[PDB]
Short mmCIF file of C-alpha atoms in Angstrom, two decimals:
data_model
loop_
_atom_site.label_atom_id
_atom_site.label_comp_id
_atom_site.label_asym_id
_atom_site.label_seq_id
_atom_site.Cartn_x
_atom_site.Cartn_y
_atom_site.Cartn_z
CA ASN Q 1 107.15 109.96 126.93
CA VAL Q 2 103.52 109.85 125.67
CA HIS Q 3 104.56 110.70 122.08
CA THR Q 4 108.11 109.50 121.22
CA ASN Q 5 108.09 109.61 117.41
CA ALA Q 6 105.35 112.23 117.49
CA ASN Q 7 107.87 115.01 117.90
CA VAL Q 8 108.25 117.33 114.94
CA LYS Q 9 111.77 117.98 113.64
CA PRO Q 10 112.24 121.28 111.92
CA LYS Q 11 113.12 121.28 108.22
CA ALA Q 12 116.77 121.46 107.10
CA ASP Q 13 117.74 124.72 105.40
CA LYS Q 14 118.50 123.37 101.94
CA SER Q 15 120.85 126.27 101.26
CA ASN Q 16 122.88 125.74 104.47
CA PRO Q 17 125.96 123.44 103.95
CA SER Q 18 126.01 122.44 107.62
CA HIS Q 19 122.36 121.29 107.68
CA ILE Q 20 121.98 117.62 106.80
CA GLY Q 21 118.42 116.69 105.85
CA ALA Q 22 116.74 113.32 105.43
CA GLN Q 23 116.80 112.13 101.80
CA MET Q 24 113.74 109.88 102.16
CA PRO Q 25 111.22 108.86 104.80
CA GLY Q 26 111.87 106.13 107.32
CA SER Q 27 113.44 105.26 110.63
CA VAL Q 28 116.37 106.02 112.87
CA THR Q 29 118.00 102.73 113.69
CA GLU Q 30 121.04 104.12 115.57
CA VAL Q 31 122.33 107.55 116.52
CA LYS Q 32 126.15 107.33 116.57
CA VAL Q 33 127.24 110.77 117.83
CA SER Q 34 126.47 113.59 120.30
CA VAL Q 35 126.24 117.33 120.26
CA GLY Q 36 129.90 118.28 120.73
CA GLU Q 37 131.82 115.33 119.25
CA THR Q 38 134.38 116.03 116.51
CA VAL Q 39 134.14 113.93 113.34
CA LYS Q 40 136.04 113.18 110.10
CA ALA Q 41 134.60 113.44 106.59
CA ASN Q 42 132.66 110.29 105.77
CA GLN Q 43 132.23 109.14 109.38
CA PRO Q 44 129.15 107.11 110.32
CA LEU Q 45 126.75 109.56 111.96
CA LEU Q 46 123.44 107.78 111.66
CA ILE Q 47 121.92 104.52 110.54
CA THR Q 48 118.40 104.91 109.12
CA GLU Q 49 116.03 102.30 107.73
CA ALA Q 50 113.90 103.08 104.72
CA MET Q 51 111.77 100.17 103.57
CA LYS Q 52 113.73 97.32 105.11
CA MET Q 53 116.97 98.80 103.73
CA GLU Q 54 119.75 100.33 105.85
CA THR Q 55 121.39 103.57 104.80
CA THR Q 56 124.37 105.01 106.71
CA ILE Q 57 124.51 108.82 106.96
CA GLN Q 58 128.03 110.26 106.83
CA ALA Q 59 129.91 113.44 107.70
CA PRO Q 60 130.16 115.65 104.57
CA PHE Q 61 133.47 117.24 105.70
CA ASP Q 62 135.55 117.28 108.94
CA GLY Q 63 134.03 119.19 111.89
CA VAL Q 64 131.84 119.48 115.00
CA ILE Q 65 128.34 118.13 115.62
CA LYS Q 66 126.25 121.02 116.85
CA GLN Q 67 122.75 119.60 117.07
CA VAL Q 68 121.42 116.02 116.74
CA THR Q 69 117.67 115.96 116.10
CA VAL Q 70 116.65 112.30 116.47
CA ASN Q 71 116.63 109.29 118.84
CA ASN Q 72 116.80 105.57 118.12
CA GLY Q 73 113.48 104.60 116.55
CA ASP Q 74 112.17 108.06 115.69
CA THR Q 75 110.54 108.49 112.30
CA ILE Q 76 111.48 111.07 109.69
CA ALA Q 77 110.13 112.61 106.50
CA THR Q 78 112.06 113.77 103.49
CA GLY Q 79 113.53 117.15 104.45
CA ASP Q 80 113.81 116.77 108.24
CA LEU Q 81 116.94 118.20 109.83
CA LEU Q 82 118.95 115.36 111.27
CA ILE Q 83 122.30 116.96 112.12
CA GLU Q 84 124.22 120.27 112.19
CA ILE Q 85 128.05 120.18 111.66
CA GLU Q 86 130.72 122.91 111.23
CA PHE F 1 109.84 54.87 109.37
CA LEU F 2 106.70 52.68 109.19
CA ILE F 3 106.50 53.64 105.50
CA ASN F 4 109.98 52.14 105.07
CA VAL F 5 108.85 49.00 106.91
CA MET F 6 105.78 48.60 104.69
CA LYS F 7 108.03 48.68 101.63
CA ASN F 8 110.44 46.02 102.84
CA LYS F 9 110.55 42.58 101.18
CA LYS F 10 111.41 40.91 104.45
CA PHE F 11 108.26 42.48 105.83
CA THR F 12 106.11 41.48 102.85
CA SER F 13 107.34 37.84 102.70
CA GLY F 14 106.17 37.15 106.28
CA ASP F 15 109.70 35.90 106.87
CA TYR F 16 110.60 38.34 109.66
CA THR F 17 111.30 37.78 113.38
CA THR F 18 111.45 40.04 116.43
CA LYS F 19 115.05 40.93 115.55
CA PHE F 20 113.78 42.15 112.17
CA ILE F 21 114.58 45.80 112.94
CA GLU F 22 118.07 45.65 114.48
CA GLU F 23 118.89 43.46 111.51
CA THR F 24 117.73 45.91 108.86
CA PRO F 25 119.78 49.18 108.77
CA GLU F 26 117.87 50.78 105.84
CA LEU F 27 114.62 51.39 107.78
CA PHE F 28 116.47 54.50 108.95
CA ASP F 29 117.20 56.14 105.60
CA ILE F 30 114.30 58.49 106.14
CA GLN F 31 114.79 61.88 104.50
CA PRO F 32 113.26 65.09 105.81
CA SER F 33 110.74 65.90 103.09
CA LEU F 34 109.48 69.44 102.37
CA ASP F 35 106.12 70.98 102.33
CA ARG F 36 106.29 73.46 99.52
CA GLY F 37 102.69 74.42 100.34
CA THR F 38 103.66 75.60 103.80
CA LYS F 39 106.74 77.51 102.77
CA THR F 40 104.64 79.38 100.26
CA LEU F 41 102.05 80.27 102.90
CA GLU F 42 105.01 81.40 104.98
CA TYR F 43 106.39 83.64 102.26
CA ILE F 44 103.04 85.29 101.57
CA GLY F 45 102.51 85.48 105.33
CA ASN F 46 105.75 87.29 105.87
CA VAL F 47 105.59 89.83 103.04
CA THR F 48 101.97 90.56 103.85
CA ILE F 49 102.85 91.40 107.41
CA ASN F 50 106.29 93.02 107.10
CA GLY F 51 106.51 94.31 103.58
CA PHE F 52 109.24 93.87 101.03
CA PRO F 53 112.60 95.68 100.76
CA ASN F 54 112.25 99.03 98.80
CA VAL F 55 108.60 98.59 98.17
CA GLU F 56 106.52 101.39 99.65
CA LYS F 57 104.50 99.66 102.37
CA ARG F 58 100.91 99.93 101.22
CA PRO F 59 97.86 97.77 100.57
CA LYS F 60 98.34 95.46 97.52
CA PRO F 61 97.34 97.57 94.61
CA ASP F 62 94.32 96.80 92.51
CA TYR F 63 95.91 96.41 89.07
CA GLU F 64 94.31 96.06 85.64
CA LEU F 65 93.65 92.70 83.99
CA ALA F 66 95.71 92.93 80.85
CA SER F 67 94.53 89.43 79.90
CA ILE F 68 97.52 87.89 78.28
CA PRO F 69 97.65 86.99 74.52
CA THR F 70 98.97 83.50 73.80
CA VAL F 71 99.88 81.54 70.65
CA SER F 72 99.19 77.79 70.56
CA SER F 73 102.30 75.76 71.12
CA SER F 74 102.02 73.45 68.10
CA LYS F 75 101.81 76.55 65.94
CA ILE F 76 105.11 77.76 67.43
CA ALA F 77 106.70 74.36 66.73
CA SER F 78 105.99 74.97 63.02
CA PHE F 79 107.99 78.22 62.88
CA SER F 80 111.43 78.29 61.28
CA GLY F 81 113.35 81.41 62.21
CA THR F 82 116.99 82.30 62.93
CA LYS F 83 117.28 79.45 65.48
CA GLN F 84 116.68 76.75 62.87
CA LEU F 85 118.92 78.68 60.50
CA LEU F 86 121.83 78.45 62.93
CA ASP F 87 121.25 74.65 63.31
CA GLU F 88 121.53 74.33 59.50
CA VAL F 89 124.36 76.61 58.38
CA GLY F 90 126.22 77.36 61.61
#
């Protein structure tokens, strides 16, 4: 806890269906799931904030969250891996 | 309040007594009146500090002049286009 948003996420593999990457830069407002939870297609996973606008990130299909890369109030660049699902 | 007193004909006449207030219900139709000036300074203040939705946070760009061509307004009043034509023939 000297850097909190100065951790570096890896980059999503664009050609991996289970990698969800950030679509633009901004802010994690609220992580809504843990490594291990099962989810349904279209479930709230993540609320981000872009430039004063809230976007909700959803499950693409049904499955199992395998890694969650961010914490409330971390910052993100286009392309950052946010979640793995199966 | 005082403003409303100043305006009152009972006041102006000299008529009034000590019961002049209790006796004069309208002294209390004061209306909360704006300051547009302030609210503007508050808008600018807020956007300056916290940005605007969907605008990339960044110093206010230097833009170009494009000084804006105008046409005198009495010259415009002399034109007769498809507006006037509708007024005539429907």
